[PDB]
Amino acid sequence: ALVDSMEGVGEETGGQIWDPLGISEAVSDEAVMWFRASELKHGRVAMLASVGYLVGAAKISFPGELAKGVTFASVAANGPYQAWDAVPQAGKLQILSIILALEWATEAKKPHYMRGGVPGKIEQLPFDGIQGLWAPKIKFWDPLNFTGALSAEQKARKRKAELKNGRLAMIGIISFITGHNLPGSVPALDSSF
Amino acid sequence: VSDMEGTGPETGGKVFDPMGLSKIASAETLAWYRAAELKHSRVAMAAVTGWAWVSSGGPLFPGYLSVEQGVTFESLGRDGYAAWAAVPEAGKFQILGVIGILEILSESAVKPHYMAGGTPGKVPLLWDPLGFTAKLSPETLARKRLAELKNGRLAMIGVMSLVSAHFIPNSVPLLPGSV
Amino acid sequence: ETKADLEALAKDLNPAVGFWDPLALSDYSFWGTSQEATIGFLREAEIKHGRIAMAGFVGYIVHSNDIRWTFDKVAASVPTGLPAPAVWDAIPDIAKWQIILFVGVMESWRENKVVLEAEGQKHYMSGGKPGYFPSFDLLPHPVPFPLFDPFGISKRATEEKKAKGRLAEINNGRLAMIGLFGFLSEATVPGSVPFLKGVVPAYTGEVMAPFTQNIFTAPTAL
Amino acid sequence: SAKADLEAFAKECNPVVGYWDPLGLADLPLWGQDQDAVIGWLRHSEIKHGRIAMAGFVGYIAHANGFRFGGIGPQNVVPEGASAPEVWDSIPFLAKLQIIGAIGVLEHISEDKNFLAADGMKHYMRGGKPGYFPTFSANVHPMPLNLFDPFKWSKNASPEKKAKGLVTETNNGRLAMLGLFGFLSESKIPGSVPALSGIIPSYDGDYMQPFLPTGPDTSLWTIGNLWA
Amino acid sequence: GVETELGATGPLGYWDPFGFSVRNPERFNRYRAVELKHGRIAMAATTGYMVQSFLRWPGYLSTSANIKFADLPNGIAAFKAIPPAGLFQILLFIGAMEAFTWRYYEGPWPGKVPEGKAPGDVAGDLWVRYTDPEEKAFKLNAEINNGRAAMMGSLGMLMHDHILGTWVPPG
Amino acid sequence: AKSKAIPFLDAPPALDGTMAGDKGFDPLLLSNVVPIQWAREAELKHARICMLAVVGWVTVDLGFTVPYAPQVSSLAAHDAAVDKGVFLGLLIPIALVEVLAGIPKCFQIMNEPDASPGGDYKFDPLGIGASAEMQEKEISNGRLAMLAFSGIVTQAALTQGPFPYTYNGVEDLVPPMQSVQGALSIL
Numbered sequence A: 001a002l003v004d005s006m007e008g009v010g011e012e013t014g015g016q017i018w019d020p021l022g023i024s025e026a027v028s029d030e031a032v033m034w035f036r037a038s039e040l041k042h043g044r045v046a047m048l049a050s051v052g053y054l055v056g057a058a059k060i061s062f063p064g065e066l067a068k069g070v071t072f073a074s075v076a077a078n079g080p081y082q083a084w085d086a087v088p089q090a091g092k093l094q095i096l097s098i099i100l101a102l103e104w105a106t107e108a109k110k111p112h113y114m115r116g117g118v119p120g121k122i123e124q125l126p127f128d129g130i131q132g133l134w135a136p137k138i139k140f141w142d143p144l145n146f147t148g149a150l151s152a153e154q155k156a157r158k159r160k161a162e163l164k165n166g167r168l169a170m171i172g173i174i175s176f177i178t179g180h181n182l183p184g185s186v187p188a189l190d191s192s193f
Numbered sequence B: 001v002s003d004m005e006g007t008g009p010e011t012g013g014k015v016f017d018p019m020g021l022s023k024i025a026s027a028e029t030l031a032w033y034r035a036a037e038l039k040h041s042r043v044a045m046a047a048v049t050g051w052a053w054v055s056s057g058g059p060l061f062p063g064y065l066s067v068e069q070g071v072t073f074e075s076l077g078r079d080g081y082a083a084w085a086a087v088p089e090a091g092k093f094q095i096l097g098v099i100g101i102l103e104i105l106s107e108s109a110v111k112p113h114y115m116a117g118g119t120p121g122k123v124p125l126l127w128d129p130l131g132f133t134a135k136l137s138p139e140t141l142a143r144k145r146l147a148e149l150k151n152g153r154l155a156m157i158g159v160m161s162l163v164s165a166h167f168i169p170n171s172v173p174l175l176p177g178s179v
Numbered sequence C: 001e002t003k004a005d006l007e008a009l010a011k012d013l014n015p016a017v018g019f020w021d022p023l024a025l026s027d028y029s030f031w032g033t034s035q036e037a038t039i040g041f042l043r044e045a046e047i048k049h050g051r052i053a054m055a056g057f058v059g060y061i062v063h064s065n066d067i068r069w070t071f072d073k074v075a076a077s078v079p080t081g082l083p084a085p086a087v088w089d090a091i092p093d094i095a096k097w098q099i100i101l102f103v104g105v106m107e108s109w110r111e112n113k114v115v116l117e118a119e120g121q122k123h124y125m126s127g128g129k130p131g132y133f134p135s136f137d138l139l140p141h142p143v144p145f146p147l148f149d150p151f152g153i154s155k156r157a158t159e160e161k162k163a164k165g166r167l168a169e170i171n172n173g174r175l176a177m178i179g180l181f182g183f184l185s186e187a188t189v190p191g192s193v194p195f196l197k198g199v200v201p202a203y204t205g206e207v208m209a210p211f212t213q214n215i216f217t218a219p220t221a222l
Numbered sequence D: 001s002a003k004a005d006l007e008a009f010a011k012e013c014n015p016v017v018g019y020w021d022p023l024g025l026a027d028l029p030l031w032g033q034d035q036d037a038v039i040g041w042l043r044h045s046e047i048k049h050g051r052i053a054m055a056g057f058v059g060y061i062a063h064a065n066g067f068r069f070g071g072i073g074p075q076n077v078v079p080e081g082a083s084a085p086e087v088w089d090s091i092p093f094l095a096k097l098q099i100i101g102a103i104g105v106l107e108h109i110s111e112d113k114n115f116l117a118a119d120g121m122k123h124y125m126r127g128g129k130p131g132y133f134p135t136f137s138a139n140v141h142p143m144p145l146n147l148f149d150p151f152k153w154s155k156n157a158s159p160e161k162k163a164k165g166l167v168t169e170t171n172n173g174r175l176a177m178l179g180l181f182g183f184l185s186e187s188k189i190p191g192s193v194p195a196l197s198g199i200i201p202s203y204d205g206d207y208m209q210p211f212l213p214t215g216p217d218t219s220l221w222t223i224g225n226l227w228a
Numbered sequence E: 001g002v003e004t005e006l007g008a009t010g011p012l013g014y015w016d017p018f019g020f021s022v023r024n025p026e027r028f029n030r031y032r033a034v035e036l037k038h039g040r041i042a043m044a045a046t047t048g049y050m051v052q053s054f055l056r057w058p059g060y061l062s063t064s065a066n067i068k069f070a071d072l073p074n075g076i077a078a079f080k081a082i083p084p085a086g087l088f089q090i091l092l093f094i095g096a097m098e099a100f101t102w103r104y105y106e107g108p109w110p111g112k113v114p115e116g117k118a119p120g121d122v123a124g125d126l127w128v129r130y131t132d133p134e135e136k137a138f139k140l141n142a143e144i145n146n147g148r149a150a151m152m153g154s155l156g157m158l159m160h161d162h163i164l165g166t167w168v169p170p171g
Numbered sequence F: 001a002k003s004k005a006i007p008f009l010d011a012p013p014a015l016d017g018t019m020a021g022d023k024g025f026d027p028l029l030l031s032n033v034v035p036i037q038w039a040r041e042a043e044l045k046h047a048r049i050c051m052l053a054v055v056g057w058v059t060v061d062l063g064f065t066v067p068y069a070p071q072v073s074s075l076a077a078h079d080a081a082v083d084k085g086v087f088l089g090l091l092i093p094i095a096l097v098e099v100l101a102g103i104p105k106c107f108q109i110m111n112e113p114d115a116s117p118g119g120d121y122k123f124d125p126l127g128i129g130a131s132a133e134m135q136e137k138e139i140s141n142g143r144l145a146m147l148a149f150s151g152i153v154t155q156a157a158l159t160q161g162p163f164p165y166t167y168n169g170v171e172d173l174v175p176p177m178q179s180v181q182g183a184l185s186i187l
């Protein structure tokens, strides 16, 4: 099975595959690559979202003005929760448009993670090789190219760190949202959440 | 990073890197670091020279900056962040657009981009239009590049000393309390 | 450990009482696991409860006599003269939730296969040492001391002394689980412990209720 | 072994007591570093604390009794008769900053690989002498005098004498630590150092906040005071 | 193996996105038993919703509680409004059929399908048995397919009636 | 044998795999009753008309207008043009092109065995090329334009709104511009 070879097993669960429900044993390898790709996607989105929520709750905002009429602090003066509404429609439209472009490109690369590809290694130069489209060769992952200074063993260690931090952030972001929704749910979250 | 320029006698004879970002940096990451260092150097040197010249009783340019709106060079006060504030927004956009065109050029024209081989901080269009440094020895050019980096590091500390003076009065000694 | 090992342990703890399991927990297979692992879990439970109860006995004496830390604001916030059970209820719930989560992190550290097998021991249910606590050698970040003997004492103790100490640990734990509960029962039920009448301050709340506001229904946040 | 050397050093410090590590700090793996590095750090901390406490004791006698340089400088804003805790509080804020910063530069030079390597030595946590301040032989601009033995009074001293001097340094540093905090403790928990009762005045103010009170913001420079 | 069994028909044919029986073909019989079970419960549930829409029984649900059949709404509110004794009797009957009458599994804890039986052949001797092989296969395929459509539909009705209070969504 | 587009049906024999845009999609086997070249001519004519219609509708609705033309949305543009008078003029080139290129080409397709394929008028003044990939792009763009025009007309008539042709505008295409505060509530 492909499960025994993947990363993600850590010292916390005794260095064993944490699958109480046994779905990893049940489903085929193809679904397992889907699950690892989705795991890393959720984990990276959550590692972005958790620090975003921290910054919003601290009310740390860039100096300037998002639109020509609203300030970054004006949007953030109602906590992270009531922020996406206060963002202008055009700004979030552009954000979601570039996210759509990235998603479509990463899915459109030929060596798909399911059908013979590394799960979670979305291609580092999306929008390249597209007929009738030119974009700068800004490497999506690590455009400064910090990876070049790391050997494969260090990359494996940092991928383990990636998975563990992603899992913790997926817990933390929902913790923040739940702390806002239900006031007493998560302790150690102040009224800003 | 040991091969790259910048290690004068002023920090031993070795690289200055407490945090060790150069250790993380690969060759192309070090190229990015040097390119960013150089661009900050050059922009800072221009900024600090302009601030000093304007706010040290230098001769403001003659005539009207904008004849249509009536804004004049003399009307723009010789004070940091007031002259820029009173400059027309169209003029601000002119400066920013020319800078943006030039920077997209310096990114798209250089062929072996500083990232993929190449030399960080080389912009053939703007440097030496009169060719002032076209017959210097390679050593001399290396020495002058070292001088460039050293002057610019000081310049980028100085421009922030000016900025933090306006935004936080009496931050810098030997500088007016206002700006 | 085998039931023969439990009989030997009981006969070394108290030769006269000997093995005195009258409910056969030592024989009931817990979760279907072998007797050698049910014995491990039960013995770890005995040691752990005795540990917590000995600490609780000393802590109850300390709280009833209001020997509090001098340089903290939570202790000052808690009113003086309260019963020791109430000195727990009068605390911010966020501090209770961090005491409990500290024990959670420590008991996650203890049962970890990797840390135990790195230090040499195994789980108490896997034939390991019941009542062992691995040090923080494999911790993500460095830390100054371990839990058991943060200082050095008993780094050079004989196995005979360790065996004597484990026997005394089990016996004192069995006694302290009864002493601390004598305090609680006399507090919440006057005239229940006949010898502490007029000694233990009375109490109305539930000692098995850690947080004032019910976490399952309506918690409080900070 | 580093612990063997430390144990012998303890016997030299006091042979009746000997090695007394009640917490096992030598054995503890600080930062994950091995026992040699940990003992190097602990020894360096001991001599650093002792040195600074000895200087602090002599400075307490100097400041409290009244011992000031003449002329323009920080001493002209400290009120006369001020307590030793009040002298630091009364010197200018920039004076406090520059004292702490100069000490920082000295510490940085002390742990710099540059100076220690120019002197043919290594960091105290990586097989070096714990408590060795290097010569300023890599300070870009030459400096006239070094910190330790500036006039080079000990240019020819026996290694046995130097070892005995380090044994003395540790002992006197420990004793000076105790005395200096005796002074500090008598001012905030009276009747704690019995001999000092009535001698050390009470001080209302945090010792461990360096910059509280921030002190005056005066400008004591006279000629060329364009920054005022 | 599994690619040619009752259920490997329709537009998709064999359909294992997450490779369950591909990884564990031994568990296909258990999965078929579970699919038949859920499908049948859902057929009953969908017909119950559709028929409770227009027809309701007469007489009192519980004369002591004064709860009438027509007074109940059509949805989860009806099961809420059944008295506790009625719910207990309902659970008792369902458990009797589950454990004794129509045993889907043979024994132990992780129940296997009965040995001398099909995956979901739970009826006794008095049950319709088809002897034509083609008709038997066709109608078993119809059973499982209608069951699948029924569970999709029943999940739809349950979610609609949870959101709104009526299984019919507006439109 | 089994069709690619429909993996539970046999593909027809007329489709084969030479024709551009061939995806084995013909569940009703209409290629047997209707000739494939005639059907392709009709497909390409419809595709081209729908492409032009989509781009013209979008431009006119966004605001681009000819001088002297009525400043109206694309929905009322037909009625406005008919009322103002100049709209048979556009029929005149349509009538010319159809009568003198479609009727003869249609008769050649049906009767003449040696004839150009459906939709091939040899109209390449720039010489961009009639490569296989180019024809595939033409067919795909055309079909997408047919469906897009159908949606555009049916939605502009329904809502009588701006270019998005949805009740709440771009918010319908993009749900997370609506609130997201109920999504965060359930989370």
Ligand SMILES: CCCCCC(=O)OC\C(C=C=C1C(C)(C)C[C@H](OC(C)=O)C[C@@]1(C)O)=C/C=C/C(C)=C/C=C/C=C(C)/C=C/C=C(\C)C(=O)C[C@@]12O[C@]1(C)C[C@@H](O)CC2(C)C
Pocket: E042, E043, E044, E046, E047, E126, E127, E128, E146, E147, E149, E150, E152, E153, E154, E156, E157, E167, E168, E169
């Ligand atoms: C005596 C005990 C008998 C128990 C068994 C029984 O009676 O079997 C009876 C039986 C067969 C049989 C046999 C007989 C020959 C007749 C009797 C013999 O019996 C004996 C004992 O010999 C043998 C047997 C059992 O073989 C057949 C039962 C068939 C049944 C009960 C089939 C339901 C499908 C529902 C579907 C697909 C729902 C889709 C639902 C969907 C897609 C939706 O929900 C859609 C929708 O709603 C949504 C979501 C919202 C609405 O706005 C809109 C609509 C409406 C569109």
Ligand SMILES: CC(=O)O[C@H]1CC(C)(C)C(=C=C/C(C)=C/C=C/C(C)=C/C=C/C=C(C)/C=C/C=C(\C)C(=O)C[C@@]23O[C@]2(C)C[C@@H](O)CC3(C)C)[C@](C)(O)C1
Pocket: C054, C055, C057, C058, C154, C165, C172, C173, C175, C176, C178, C179, C180, C181, C182, C183, C193, C194, C195, C196
């Ligand atoms: C009513 C009537 O009729 O009767 C009774 C009822 C009742 C309620 C039962 C009564 C009571 C009171 C009782 C019986 C109370 C019992 C309390 C109990 C039994 C409390 C133990 C604490 C132990 C601790 C904290 C040990 C720490 C030990 C530690 C942390 C060690 O260092 C262990 C050590 O091994 C190392 C690691 C290193 C070695 O070098 C040796 C040492 C030792 C240092 C009354 C009032 O009397 C009357």
Ligand SMILES: CC(=O)O[C@H]1CC(C)(C)C(=C=C/C(C)=C/C=C/C(C)=C/C=C/C=C(C)/C=C/C=C(\C)C(=O)C[C@@]23O[C@]2(C)C[C@@H](O)CC3(C)C)[C@](C)(O)C1
Pocket: D069, D070, D071, D072, D073
């Ligand atoms: C910051 C501020 O405001 O500061 C203020 C306050 C402050 C600091 C207190 C001030 C002060 C006071 C200061 C600094 C006073 C300094 C006084 C000073 C410097 C006094 C030296 C006397 C030396 C003698 C008599 C040597 C005789 C030496 C003799 C006999 C020889 O020459 C002998 C010999 O060499 C020959 C000729 C050559 C050879 O053949 C033989 C030898 C070698 C044997 C100021 C000035 O107010 C400034």
Ligand code: KC2
Pocket: C050, C051, C052, C054, C055, C129, C130, C131, C132, C133, C134, C147, C148, C161, C162, C163, C164, C165, C166, C168, C169, C172
């Ligand atoms: C608050 C809690 C607490 C209390 C009140 C308490 C009381 C007593 C008494 C009572 C008079 C004795 C006499 C005693 C003796 C020993 N205790 Mg003990 N102990 C507590 C906590 C822990 C922890 C966390 C550990 C531990 C251990 C040992 C060992 C080592 C044996 C060995 O190394 O073989 C010996 C000899 C360590 C271990 O491994 O125990 C198997 C270990 O990890 N204890 N302990």
Ligand SMILES: CC1=C(C#C/C(C)=C/C=C/C(C)=C/C=C/C=C(C)/C=C/C=C(C)/C=C/[C@@]23O[C@]2(C)C[C@@H](O)CC3(C)C)C(C)(C)C[C@H](O)C1
Pocket: B174, D143, D145, D146, D147, D148, D149, D150, D223, D224, D225, D226
């Ligand atoms: C001796 C010794 C040691 C020591 C020591 C100690 C205590 C050293 C202390 C040193 C100290 C405290 C040194 C201050 C310098 C101040 C300067 C340079 C200020 C210049 C100021 C200038 C240049 C200002 C100029 C201007 O305003 C002017 C005048 C007018 C204008 O025209 C121009 C401007 C505006 C710019 C070691 C090495 C530690 C150990 C060793 O063992 C023994």
Ligand SMILES: CC1=C(C#C/C(C)=C/C=C/C(C)=C/C=C/C=C(C)/C=C/C=C(C)/C=C/[C@@]23O[C@]2(C)C[C@@H](O)CC3(C)C)C(C)(C)C[C@H](O)C1
Pocket: E009, E010, E011, E012, E144, E145, E146, E148, E149, E152, E153
């Ligand atoms: C809309 C809305 C909201 C919402 C919402 C959400 C999340 C809605 C989600 C709806 C969803 C998820 C609806 C799925 C339907 C699936 C169907 C009908 C599938 C049937 C499929 C069937 C019957 C399959 C049958 C077959 O298997 C059979 C039997 C045999 C095989 O041979 C053939 C096939 C495979 C075909 C808010 C957020 C709450 C508020 C907002 O304001 C408005």
